[PDB]
Amino acid sequence: RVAIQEEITALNDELNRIAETTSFGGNKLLNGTFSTKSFQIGADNGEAVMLTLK
Amino acid sequence: NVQSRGLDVAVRNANDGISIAQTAEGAMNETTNILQRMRDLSLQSANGSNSKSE
After folding, report:
1. Fewer C-beta within 10 Å: chain A N or C terminus?
2. Which residues of A touch B49 (CB under 8 A)?
3. Which residues form a coiled coil (chain A)?
4. How far is CA A53 from the centre of its chain?
């Protein structure tokens, strides 16, 4: 059980690392700092769609 | 005869006025082109994928 817990702790640290290091050019995505961002997909202003990363 | 001479002066003045209008309109055409470029830049900047640097 201790060995399994050690491997589980390693995987948990890997999960935290994946959350904290995934980025798009330097803009973090999966650590919660990326709140709702509006992508402008229209030819005129005010035609944006919100995307939320948790 | 004085009417004819005045008419020649009138067509000369009208040509000068058309020249001034053409020059102003070409300048404003370049202004329109620059405005369209700025509008494209503003539309690009409004996207949520951009960070502060872009």
Report:
1. N
2. 24, 27, 37, 39
3. 1-21
4. 6
